[PDB]
Every structure is written in C-alpha cells, then in structure tokens.
Amino acid sequence: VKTFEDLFAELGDRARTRPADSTTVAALDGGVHALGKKLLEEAGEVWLAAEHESNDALAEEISQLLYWTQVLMISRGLSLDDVYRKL
Amino acid sequence: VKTFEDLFAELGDRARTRPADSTTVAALDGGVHALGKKLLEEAGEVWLAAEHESNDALAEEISQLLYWTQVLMISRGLSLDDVYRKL
C-alpha cells in the first residue's frame, strides 16, 4: 500500500463486494460499538509500543490503528474528503 | 490538505524548522509519554463521536487522531513507508 488513500479504496471495495473470506467484512458487520472498542484498544497498544518497543513494532501497531480508523469511517459512511477537509 | 501524505510533509517541515508559533513543536518537545496520552485520549473522543455524534463531529475527531498519530511517528522517527509497508 503506497497511500492512505490506496488502503481506503481497498477497504471500501471489501465493504462493497463483501468477500466471504474477509475479516474486514466481519468487522464491519460486528457494528460500530465493537469498532470503537477495537480502535481504543489499539490506541493503547500503540502507546505501549511508543514507550517500550522498537520502531518496527510501533509501525505495526500504528498500521493497525490506521486500519481500524478507516474501517470506522466506512461503517459511518465517511469519505476520505470528509476527514481530509478537516486536516 | 489533499492527503494524509500532505499533512505528514507539513508536520515534518515543522519538526525540521521548529517555527516558534507552532503547537506541533511544543508537542514534539514534550516527548513520547505526553503524545501517547494525547493519542489515547483522542481515540476515546473518536469512540464517543462514533456512538453519539454527527458525521461532521466524527470526521473532526478522526482528523485529530490522525494528527496525533503522525506527530507520534515524527517523534519516534517513523516514515510513511515504515507504516505503509505493514499495511
């Protein structure tokens, strides 16, 4: 993945076409409450790695946080531009 | 801002030139413990907005979470590639 926007396109595609094999689809189907839960937990994990783990370890956790953030966006029907206009 | 990548370049520029007027610069200087705390707190505010606020308010909180995520990246010396390669 080369951009934040490439990831979003890919996740949106999963949301649309609903591949049976997709953990993304399951997560969307699990609903917003569970998505917020996951996002928060991952924030904690990012903090843990920020203080105690290697760059590689932190990059991994940050990548997961970004993932859940975009899944959350999709579940509430937010576009990239909806967020991008606020940055 | 036309990207996550635009913002990251902007924040890197602030880290490089250290403009006196920037709250970003103060955040960088305070170190990683305060940054993780801010990130976790924002993750909470994202969850609050996901369950109980309008798309516009949610987009706002998400913009802030992404800001704090990038500031953390810059603090620890992670590149976009470092994160994206794990996506």
mmCIF file of N, CA, C and O in Angstrom, chain A residues 1-5 7 10 32-34 36-37 39-40 43-44 46-47 49-60 62-67 69 72-73 76-78 81-87, chain B residues 1-5 7 32-37 39-40 43-44 46-47 49-60 62-67 69 72-73 76-78 81-87:
data_model
loop_
_atom_site.group_PDB
_atom_site.id
_atom_site.type_symbol
_atom_site.label_atom_id
_atom_site.label_comp_id
_atom_site.label_asym_id
_atom_site.label_seq_id
_atom_site.Cartn_x
_atom_site.Cartn_y
_atom_site.Cartn_z
ATOM 1 N N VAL A 1 0.866 -1.215 0.000
ATOM 2 C CA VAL A 1 0.000 0.000 0.000
ATOM 3 C C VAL A 1 0.889 1.247 0.000
ATOM 4 O O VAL A 1 1.825 1.359 0.800
ATOM 5 N N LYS A 2 0.621 2.172 -0.915
ATOM 6 C CA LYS A 2 1.509 3.330 -1.089
ATOM 7 C C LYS A 2 0.939 4.604 -0.503
ATOM 8 O O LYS A 2 1.680 5.547 -0.204
ATOM 9 N N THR A 3 -0.377 4.635 -0.342
ATOM 10 C CA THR A 3 -1.004 5.789 0.243
ATOM 11 C C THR A 3 -2.085 5.383 1.249
ATOM 12 O O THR A 3 -2.565 4.232 1.268
ATOM 13 N N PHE A 4 -2.437 6.338 2.094
ATOM 14 C CA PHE A 4 -3.570 6.214 2.995
ATOM 15 C C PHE A 4 -4.810 5.993 2.121
ATOM 16 O O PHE A 4 -5.683 5.187 2.445
ATOM 17 N N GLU A 5 -4.839 6.694 0.989
ATOM 18 C CA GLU A 5 -5.935 6.611 0.029
ATOM 19 C C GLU A 5 -6.042 5.274 -0.712
ATOM 20 O O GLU A 5 -7.167 4.833 -0.993
ATOM 21 N N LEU A 7 -5.189 2.320 0.696
ATOM 22 C CA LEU A 7 -5.786 1.471 1.725
ATOM 23 C C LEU A 7 -7.291 1.678 1.785
ATOM 24 O O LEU A 7 -8.056 0.706 1.801
ATOM 25 N N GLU A 10 -9.178 0.134 -1.049
ATOM 26 C CA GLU A 10 -9.171 -1.306 -0.919
ATOM 27 C C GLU A 10 -10.217 -1.744 0.100
ATOM 28 O O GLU A 10 -10.990 -2.664 -0.151
ATOM 29 N N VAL A 32 -20.619 -0.670 14.931
ATOM 30 C CA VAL A 32 -19.805 0.478 15.332
ATOM 31 C C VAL A 32 -19.278 0.394 16.761
ATOM 32 O O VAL A 32 -18.144 0.815 17.041
ATOM 33 N N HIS A 33 -20.091 -0.140 17.671
ATOM 34 C CA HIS A 33 -19.691 -0.195 19.058
ATOM 35 C C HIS A 33 -18.423 -1.013 19.188
ATOM 36 O O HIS A 33 -17.456 -0.568 19.826
ATOM 37 N N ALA A 34 -18.416 -2.194 18.568
ATOM 38 C CA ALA A 34 -17.255 -3.076 18.587
ATOM 39 C C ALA A 34 -16.055 -2.463 17.836
ATOM 40 O O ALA A 34 -14.912 -2.693 18.219
ATOM 41 N N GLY A 36 -15.306 0.867 17.649
ATOM 42 C CA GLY A 36 -14.758 1.824 18.631
ATOM 43 C C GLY A 36 -13.923 1.139 19.702
ATOM 44 O O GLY A 36 -12.864 1.648 20.107
ATOM 45 N N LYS A 37 -14.410 -0.011 20.167
ATOM 46 C CA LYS A 37 -13.705 -0.839 21.142
ATOM 47 C C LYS A 37 -12.321 -1.193 20.626
ATOM 48 O O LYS A 37 -11.327 -1.073 21.343
ATOM 49 N N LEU A 39 -10.641 0.164 18.105
ATOM 50 C CA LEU A 39 -9.839 1.370 17.884
ATOM 51 C C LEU A 39 -9.174 1.819 19.192
ATOM 52 O O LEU A 39 -7.955 2.078 19.232
ATOM 53 N N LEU A 40 -9.961 1.870 20.271
ATOM 54 C CA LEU A 40 -9.416 2.256 21.575
ATOM 55 C C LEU A 40 -8.309 1.309 22.072
ATOM 56 O O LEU A 40 -7.218 1.751 22.443
ATOM 57 N N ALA A 43 -5.179 1.915 20.158
ATOM 58 C CA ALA A 43 -4.526 3.124 20.681
ATOM 59 C C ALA A 43 -3.645 2.785 21.897
ATOM 60 O O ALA A 43 -2.528 3.297 22.024
ATOM 61 N N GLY A 44 -4.164 1.959 22.800
ATOM 62 C CA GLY A 44 -3.397 1.513 23.965
ATOM 63 C C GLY A 44 -2.152 0.756 23.544
ATOM 64 O O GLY A 44 -1.050 0.976 24.061
ATOM 65 N N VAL A 46 -0.613 1.030 20.677
ATOM 66 C CA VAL A 46 0.311 1.993 20.078
ATOM 67 C C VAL A 46 1.095 2.676 21.204
ATOM 68 O O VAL A 46 2.318 2.802 21.117
ATOM 69 N N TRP A 47 0.402 3.074 22.271
ATOM 70 C CA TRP A 47 1.068 3.747 23.381
ATOM 71 C C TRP A 47 2.132 2.820 24.010
ATOM 72 O O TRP A 47 3.288 3.220 24.193
ATOM 73 N N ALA A 49 3.787 0.358 22.628
ATOM 74 C CA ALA A 49 4.916 0.258 21.706
ATOM 75 C C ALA A 49 5.710 1.572 21.640
ATOM 76 O O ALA A 49 6.954 1.563 21.489
ATOM 77 N N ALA A 50 5.000 2.695 21.769
ATOM 78 C CA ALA A 50 5.632 4.023 21.741
ATOM 79 C C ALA A 50 6.650 4.132 22.863
ATOM 80 O O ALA A 50 7.728 4.708 22.680
ATOM 81 N N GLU A 51 6.317 3.548 24.014
ATOM 82 C CA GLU A 51 7.183 3.653 25.180
ATOM 83 C C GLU A 51 8.243 2.562 25.301
ATOM 84 O O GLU A 51 9.279 2.769 25.944
ATOM 85 N N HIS A 52 8.007 1.402 24.699
ATOM 86 C CA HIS A 52 8.804 0.244 25.073
ATOM 87 C C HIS A 52 9.267 -0.642 23.933
ATOM 88 O O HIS A 52 10.099 -1.533 24.136
ATOM 89 N N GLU A 53 8.742 -0.412 22.737
ATOM 90 C CA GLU A 53 9.030 -1.328 21.655
ATOM 91 C C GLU A 53 9.805 -0.636 20.557
ATOM 92 O O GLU A 53 9.943 0.594 20.576
ATOM 93 N N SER A 54 10.317 -1.443 19.629
ATOM 94 C CA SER A 54 11.127 -0.989 18.506
ATOM 95 C C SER A 54 10.289 -0.207 17.493
ATOM 96 O O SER A 54 9.052 -0.300 17.474
ATOM 97 N N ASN A 55 10.974 0.547 16.639
ATOM 98 C CA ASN A 55 10.309 1.219 15.517
ATOM 99 C C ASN A 55 9.436 0.295 14.682
ATOM 100 O O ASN A 55 8.311 0.668 14.317
ATOM 101 N N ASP A 56 9.947 -0.904 14.404
ATOM 102 C CA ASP A 56 9.215 -1.900 13.642
ATOM 103 C C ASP A 56 7.922 -2.263 14.360
ATOM 104 O O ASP A 56 6.851 -2.264 13.756
ATOM 105 N N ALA A 57 8.038 -2.580 15.651
ATOM 106 C CA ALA A 57 6.889 -2.908 16.489
ATOM 107 C C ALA A 57 5.863 -1.759 16.527
ATOM 108 O O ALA A 57 4.641 -1.984 16.397
ATOM 109 N N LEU A 58 6.351 -0.529 16.676
ATOM 110 C CA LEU A 58 5.463 0.626 16.697
ATOM 111 C C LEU A 58 4.781 0.816 15.334
ATOM 112 O O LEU A 58 3.593 1.156 15.274
ATOM 113 N N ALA A 59 5.530 0.615 14.248
ATOM 114 C CA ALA A 59 4.983 0.788 12.897
ATOM 115 C C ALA A 59 3.832 -0.190 12.671
ATOM 116 O O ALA A 59 2.794 0.175 12.125
ATOM 117 N N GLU A 60 4.032 -1.427 13.112
ATOM 118 C CA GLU A 60 2.999 -2.459 13.077
ATOM 119 C C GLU A 60 1.708 -2.010 13.780
ATOM 120 O O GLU A 60 0.611 -2.090 13.203
ATOM 121 N N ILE A 62 0.835 1.054 14.656
ATOM 122 C CA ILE A 62 0.271 2.250 14.006
ATOM 123 C C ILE A 62 -0.500 1.850 12.759
ATOM 124 O O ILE A 62 -1.583 2.385 12.476
ATOM 125 N N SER A 63 0.049 0.902 12.012
ATOM 126 C CA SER A 63 -0.631 0.402 10.817
ATOM 127 C C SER A 63 -2.012 -0.178 11.155
ATOM 128 O O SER A 63 -2.958 0.033 10.414
ATOM 129 N N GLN A 64 -2.113 -0.875 12.288
ATOM 130 C CA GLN A 64 -3.390 -1.415 12.760
ATOM 131 C C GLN A 64 -4.360 -0.288 13.161
ATOM 132 O O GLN A 64 -5.553 -0.367 12.874
ATOM 133 N N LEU A 65 -3.846 0.742 13.835
ATOM 134 C CA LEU A 65 -4.687 1.865 14.249
ATOM 135 C C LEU A 65 -5.300 2.529 13.028
ATOM 136 O O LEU A 65 -6.493 2.835 13.005
ATOM 137 N N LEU A 66 -4.470 2.759 12.014
ATOM 138 C CA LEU A 66 -4.941 3.385 10.769
ATOM 139 C C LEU A 66 -6.024 2.539 10.103
ATOM 140 O O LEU A 66 -7.048 3.059 9.652
ATOM 141 N N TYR A 67 -5.786 1.237 10.068
ATOM 142 C CA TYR A 67 -6.757 0.281 9.586
ATOM 143 C C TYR A 67 -8.110 0.468 10.275
ATOM 144 O O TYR A 67 -9.114 0.748 9.620
ATOM 145 N N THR A 69 -9.256 2.879 12.017
ATOM 146 C CA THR A 69 -9.782 4.240 11.792
ATOM 147 C C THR A 69 -10.574 4.284 10.476
ATOM 148 O O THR A 69 -11.674 4.829 10.418
ATOM 149 N N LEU A 72 -13.795 2.219 10.693
ATOM 150 C CA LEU A 72 -14.754 3.092 11.368
ATOM 151 C C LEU A 72 -15.382 4.121 10.431
ATOM 152 O O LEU A 72 -16.601 4.310 10.419
ATOM 153 N N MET A 73 -14.545 4.784 9.638
ATOM 154 C CA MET A 73 -15.013 5.727 8.629
ATOM 155 C C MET A 73 -16.043 5.085 7.705
ATOM 156 O O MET A 73 -17.133 5.622 7.510
ATOM 157 N N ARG A 76 -19.537 4.347 9.226
ATOM 158 C CA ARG A 76 -20.362 5.553 9.385
ATOM 159 C C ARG A 76 -20.534 6.318 8.064
ATOM 160 O O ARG A 76 -21.100 7.412 8.051
ATOM 161 N N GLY A 77 -20.064 5.731 6.964
ATOM 162 C CA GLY A 77 -20.181 6.347 5.648
ATOM 163 C C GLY A 77 -19.415 7.653 5.468
ATOM 164 O O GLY A 77 -19.851 8.529 4.706
ATOM 165 N N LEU A 78 -18.285 7.788 6.167
ATOM 166 C CA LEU A 78 -17.353 8.892 5.934
ATOM 167 C C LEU A 78 -16.458 8.632 4.730
ATOM 168 O O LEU A 78 -15.905 7.535 4.570
ATOM 169 N N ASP A 81 -12.446 12.578 1.853
ATOM 170 C CA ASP A 81 -12.509 14.039 1.822
ATOM 171 C C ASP A 81 -13.192 14.608 3.065
ATOM 172 O O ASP A 81 -12.786 15.650 3.562
ATOM 173 N N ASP A 82 -14.197 13.908 3.580
ATOM 174 C CA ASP A 82 -14.847 14.334 4.820
ATOM 175 C C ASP A 82 -13.826 14.587 5.928
ATOM 176 O O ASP A 82 -13.927 15.573 6.654
ATOM 177 N N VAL A 83 -12.846 13.691 6.038
ATOM 178 C CA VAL A 83 -11.755 13.820 7.013
ATOM 179 C C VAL A 83 -10.690 14.811 6.521
ATOM 180 O O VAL A 83 -10.253 15.697 7.266
ATOM 181 N N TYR A 84 -10.294 14.647 5.260
ATOM 182 C CA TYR A 84 -9.222 15.433 4.647
ATOM 183 C C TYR A 84 -9.493 16.942 4.715
ATOM 184 O O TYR A 84 -8.575 17.733 4.930
ATOM 185 N N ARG A 85 -10.760 17.333 4.564
ATOM 186 C CA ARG A 85 -11.172 18.733 4.710
ATOM 187 C C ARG A 85 -10.925 19.313 6.098
ATOM 188 O O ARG A 85 -10.927 20.529 6.264
ATOM 189 N N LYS A 86 -10.744 18.444 7.093
ATOM 190 C CA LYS A 86 -10.539 18.863 8.478
ATOM 191 C C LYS A 86 -9.067 18.930 8.922
ATOM 192 O O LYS A 86 -8.777 19.423 10.012
ATOM 193 N N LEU A 87 -8.151 18.446 8.083
ATOM 194 C CA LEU A 87 -6.729 18.360 8.457
ATOM 195 C C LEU A 87 -5.942 19.654 8.235
ATOM 196 O O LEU A 87 -6.441 20.618 7.646
ATOM 197 N N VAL B 1 -5.554 20.512 2.655
ATOM 198 C CA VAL B 1 -4.855 19.193 2.645
ATOM 199 C C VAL B 1 -5.514 18.244 1.657
ATOM 200 O O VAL B 1 -6.723 17.972 1.729
ATOM 201 N N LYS B 2 -4.711 17.763 0.716
ATOM 202 C CA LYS B 2 -5.197 16.835 -0.295
ATOM 203 C C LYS B 2 -4.802 15.398 0.076
ATOM 204 O O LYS B 2 -5.198 14.442 -0.607
ATOM 205 N N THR B 3 -4.038 15.249 1.165
ATOM 206 C CA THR B 3 -3.657 13.923 1.662
ATOM 207 C C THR B 3 -3.261 13.825 3.137
ATOM 208 O O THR B 3 -2.873 14.802 3.803
ATOM 209 N N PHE B 4 -3.355 12.591 3.617
ATOM 210 C CA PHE B 4 -2.602 12.135 4.762
ATOM 211 C C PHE B 4 -1.114 12.467 4.539
ATOM 212 O O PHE B 4 -0.432 12.929 5.459
ATOM 213 N N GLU B 5 -0.634 12.228 3.315
ATOM 214 C CA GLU B 5 0.764 12.493 2.939
ATOM 215 C C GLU B 5 1.154 13.994 2.959
ATOM 216 O O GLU B 5 2.264 14.330 3.383
ATOM 217 N N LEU B 7 -0.219 16.295 4.942
ATOM 218 C CA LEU B 7 -0.103 16.648 6.339
ATOM 219 C C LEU B 7 1.230 16.145 6.887
ATOM 220 O O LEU B 7 1.938 16.872 7.584
ATOM 221 N N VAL B 32 7.475 11.507 24.198
ATOM 222 C CA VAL B 32 6.601 10.441 23.747
ATOM 223 C C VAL B 32 5.497 10.101 24.745
ATOM 224 O O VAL B 32 4.388 9.719 24.339
ATOM 225 N N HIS B 33 5.782 10.227 26.039
ATOM 226 C CA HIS B 33 4.762 9.885 27.049
ATOM 227 C C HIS B 33 3.495 10.764 26.918
ATOM 228 O O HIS B 33 2.364 10.247 26.926
ATOM 229 N N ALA B 34 3.684 12.080 26.789
ATOM 230 C CA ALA B 34 2.578 13.027 26.615
ATOM 231 C C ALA B 34 1.841 12.811 25.276
ATOM 232 O O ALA B 34 0.628 12.988 25.190
ATOM 233 N N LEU B 35 2.584 12.425 24.240
ATOM 234 C CA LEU B 35 1.998 12.159 22.917
ATOM 235 C C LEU B 35 1.084 10.934 22.919
ATOM 236 O O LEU B 35 -0.008 10.983 22.358
ATOM 237 N N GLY B 36 1.534 9.839 23.537
ATOM 238 C CA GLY B 36 0.713 8.629 23.660
ATOM 239 C C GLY B 36 -0.550 8.928 24.456
ATOM 240 O O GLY B 36 -1.640 8.476 24.110
ATOM 241 N N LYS B 37 -0.399 9.711 25.516
ATOM 242 C CA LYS B 37 -1.531 10.082 26.341
ATOM 243 C C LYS B 37 -2.566 10.835 25.501
ATOM 244 O O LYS B 37 -3.772 10.547 25.583
ATOM 245 N N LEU B 39 -2.873 10.744 22.189
ATOM 246 C CA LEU B 39 -3.400 9.820 21.190
ATOM 247 C C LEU B 39 -4.515 8.934 21.782
ATOM 248 O O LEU B 39 -5.562 8.745 21.164
ATOM 249 N N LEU B 40 -4.287 8.400 22.979
ATOM 250 C CA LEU B 40 -5.269 7.517 23.615
ATOM 251 C C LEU B 40 -6.537 8.304 23.931
ATOM 252 O O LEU B 40 -7.660 7.843 23.671
ATOM 253 N N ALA B 43 -8.472 8.827 20.811
ATOM 254 C CA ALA B 43 -9.116 7.567 20.455
ATOM 255 C C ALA B 43 -10.437 7.426 21.231
ATOM 256 O O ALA B 43 -11.458 7.028 20.665
ATOM 257 N N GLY B 44 -10.404 7.761 22.522
ATOM 258 C CA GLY B 44 -11.636 7.839 23.329
ATOM 259 C C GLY B 44 -12.642 8.803 22.739
ATOM 260 O O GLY B 44 -13.824 8.475 22.629
ATOM 261 N N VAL B 46 -12.881 9.850 19.689
ATOM 262 C CA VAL B 46 -13.354 9.220 18.457
ATOM 263 C C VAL B 46 -14.479 8.217 18.745
ATOM 264 O O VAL B 46 -15.524 8.228 18.043
ATOM 265 N N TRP B 47 -14.271 7.357 19.754
ATOM 266 C CA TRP B 47 -15.274 6.358 20.121
ATOM 267 C C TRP B 47 -16.558 7.051 20.566
ATOM 268 O O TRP B 47 -17.657 6.678 20.148
ATOM 269 N N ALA B 49 -17.685 9.972 19.655
ATOM 270 C CA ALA B 49 -18.306 10.577 18.478
ATOM 271 C C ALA B 49 -18.911 9.517 17.554
ATOM 272 O O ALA B 49 -19.946 9.759 16.902
ATOM 273 N N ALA B 50 -18.284 8.339 17.510
ATOM 274 C CA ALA B 50 -18.775 7.250 16.668
ATOM 275 C C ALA B 50 -20.159 6.754 17.133
ATOM 276 O O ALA B 50 -21.016 6.390 16.320
ATOM 277 N N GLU B 51 -20.366 6.765 18.452
ATOM 278 C CA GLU B 51 -21.593 6.249 19.048
ATOM 279 C C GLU B 51 -22.664 7.290 19.220
ATOM 280 O O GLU B 51 -23.862 6.952 19.261
ATOM 281 N N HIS B 52 -22.253 8.551 19.323
ATOM 282 C CA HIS B 52 -23.149 9.594 19.825
ATOM 283 C C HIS B 52 -23.100 10.960 19.153
ATOM 284 O O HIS B 52 -23.724 11.902 19.654
ATOM 285 N N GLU B 53 -22.375 11.100 18.049
ATOM 286 C CA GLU B 53 -22.283 12.409 17.385
ATOM 287 C C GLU B 53 -22.489 12.307 15.874
ATOM 288 O O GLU B 53 -22.508 11.209 15.321
ATOM 289 N N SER B 54 -22.639 13.458 15.227
ATOM 290 C CA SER B 54 -22.870 13.569 13.785
ATOM 291 C C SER B 54 -21.634 13.181 12.992
ATOM 292 O O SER B 54 -20.532 13.234 13.528
ATOM 293 N N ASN B 55 -21.811 12.833 11.714
ATOM 294 C CA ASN B 55 -20.664 12.557 10.828
ATOM 295 C C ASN B 55 -19.599 13.653 10.846
ATOM 296 O O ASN B 55 -18.393 13.358 10.819
ATOM 297 N N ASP B 56 -20.044 14.904 10.905
ATOM 298 C CA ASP B 56 -19.131 16.051 10.889
ATOM 299 C C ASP B 56 -18.231 16.117 12.132
ATOM 300 O O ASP B 56 -17.033 16.394 12.032
ATOM 301 N N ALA B 57 -18.829 15.865 13.292
ATOM 302 C CA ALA B 57 -18.118 15.801 14.560
ATOM 303 C C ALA B 57 -17.163 14.598 14.575
ATOM 304 O O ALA B 57 -16.019 14.700 15.040
ATOM 305 N N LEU B 58 -17.640 13.458 14.074
ATOM 306 C CA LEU B 58 -16.789 12.278 13.962
ATOM 307 C C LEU B 58 -15.577 12.542 13.065
ATOM 308 O O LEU B 58 -14.461 12.187 13.418
ATOM 309 N N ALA B 59 -15.818 13.129 11.897
ATOM 310 C CA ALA B 59 -14.739 13.469 10.955
ATOM 311 C C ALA B 59 -13.709 14.390 11.620
ATOM 312 O O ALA B 59 -12.502 14.234 11.425
ATOM 313 N N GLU B 60 -14.199 15.349 12.399
ATOM 314 C CA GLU B 60 -13.333 16.239 13.174
ATOM 315 C C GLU B 60 -12.430 15.459 14.136
ATOM 316 O O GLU B 60 -11.205 15.642 14.113
ATOM 317 N N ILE B 62 -11.688 12.253 14.187
ATOM 318 C CA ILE B 62 -10.787 11.402 13.418
ATOM 319 C C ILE B 62 -9.588 12.215 12.878
ATOM 320 O O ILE B 62 -8.457 11.750 12.949
ATOM 321 N N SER B 63 -9.844 13.405 12.329
ATOM 322 C CA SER B 63 -8.748 14.293 11.878
ATOM 323 C C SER B 63 -7.712 14.533 12.965
ATOM 324 O O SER B 63 -6.521 14.552 12.677
ATOM 325 N N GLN B 64 -8.170 14.718 14.202
ATOM 326 C CA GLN B 64 -7.290 14.909 15.346
ATOM 327 C C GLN B 64 -6.504 13.649 15.718
ATOM 328 O O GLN B 64 -5.306 13.720 16.051
ATOM 329 N N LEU B 65 -7.180 12.500 15.688
ATOM 330 C CA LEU B 65 -6.490 11.233 15.929
ATOM 331 C C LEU B 65 -5.353 11.033 14.921
ATOM 332 O O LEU B 65 -4.270 10.591 15.291
ATOM 333 N N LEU B 66 -5.606 11.364 13.654
ATOM 334 C CA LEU B 66 -4.598 11.170 12.616
ATOM 335 C C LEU B 66 -3.445 12.146 12.796
ATOM 336 O O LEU B 66 -2.283 11.790 12.580
ATOM 337 N N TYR B 67 -3.775 13.369 13.199
ATOM 338 C CA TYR B 67 -2.753 14.363 13.542
ATOM 339 C C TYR B 67 -1.813 13.807 14.625
ATOM 340 O O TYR B 67 -0.583 13.757 14.434
ATOM 341 N N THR B 69 -1.384 10.777 15.628
ATOM 342 C CA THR B 69 -0.659 9.612 15.109
ATOM 343 C C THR B 69 0.612 10.019 14.349
ATOM 344 O O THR B 69 1.685 9.447 14.577
ATOM 345 N N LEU B 72 3.329 11.502 16.672
ATOM 346 C CA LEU B 72 4.000 10.354 17.296
ATOM 347 C C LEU B 72 5.018 9.696 16.362
ATOM 348 O O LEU B 72 6.129 9.349 16.784
ATOM 349 N N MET B 73 4.629 9.500 15.100
ATOM 350 C CA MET B 73 5.536 8.950 14.100
ATOM 351 C C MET B 73 6.793 9.801 13.995
ATOM 352 O O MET B 73 7.915 9.273 14.024
ATOM 353 N N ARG B 76 9.136 9.541 17.091
ATOM 354 C CA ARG B 76 9.906 8.287 17.099
ATOM 355 C C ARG B 76 10.734 8.021 15.822
ATOM 356 O O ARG B 76 11.449 7.010 15.724
ATOM 357 N N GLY B 77 10.649 8.917 14.844
ATOM 358 C CA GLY B 77 11.401 8.749 13.598
ATOM 359 C C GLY B 77 10.892 7.687 12.629
ATOM 360 O O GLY B 77 11.674 7.079 11.893
ATOM 361 N N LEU B 78 9.575 7.463 12.612
ATOM 362 C CA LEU B 78 8.964 6.588 11.623
ATOM 363 C C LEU B 78 8.576 7.364 10.370
ATOM 364 O O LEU B 78 8.042 8.481 10.465
ATOM 365 N N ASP B 81 6.477 5.188 4.675
ATOM 366 C CA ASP B 81 6.846 3.846 4.210
ATOM 367 C C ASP B 81 6.926 2.800 5.320
ATOM 368 O O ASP B 81 6.452 1.674 5.149
ATOM 369 N N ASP B 82 7.521 3.172 6.451
ATOM 370 C CA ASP B 82 7.653 2.259 7.580
ATOM 371 C C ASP B 82 6.279 1.708 7.977
ATOM 372 O O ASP B 82 6.126 0.514 8.202
ATOM 373 N N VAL B 83 5.285 2.592 8.040
ATOM 374 C CA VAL B 83 3.921 2.213 8.416
ATOM 375 C C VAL B 83 3.223 1.481 7.268
ATOM 376 O O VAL B 83 2.753 0.348 7.438
ATOM 377 N N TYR B 84 3.192 2.123 6.102
ATOM 378 C CA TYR B 84 2.529 1.589 4.909
ATOM 379 C C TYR B 84 2.978 0.190 4.490
ATOM 380 O O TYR B 84 2.155 -0.612 4.037
ATOM 381 N N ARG B 85 4.271 -0.102 4.644
ATOM 382 C CA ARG B 85 4.788 -1.443 4.347
ATOM 383 C C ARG B 85 4.185 -2.549 5.216
ATOM 384 O O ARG B 85 4.261 -3.732 4.869
ATOM 385 N N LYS B 86 3.570 -2.164 6.331
ATOM 386 C CA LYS B 86 2.912 -3.131 7.206
ATOM 387 C C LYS B 86 1.417 -3.267 6.890
ATOM 388 O O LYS B 86 0.743 -4.155 7.406
ATOM 389 N N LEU B 87 0.922 -2.385 6.027
ATOM 390 C CA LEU B 87 -0.464 -2.429 5.557
ATOM 391 C C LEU B 87 -0.614 -3.347 4.351
ATOM 392 O O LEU B 87 -1.733 -3.633 3.927
#
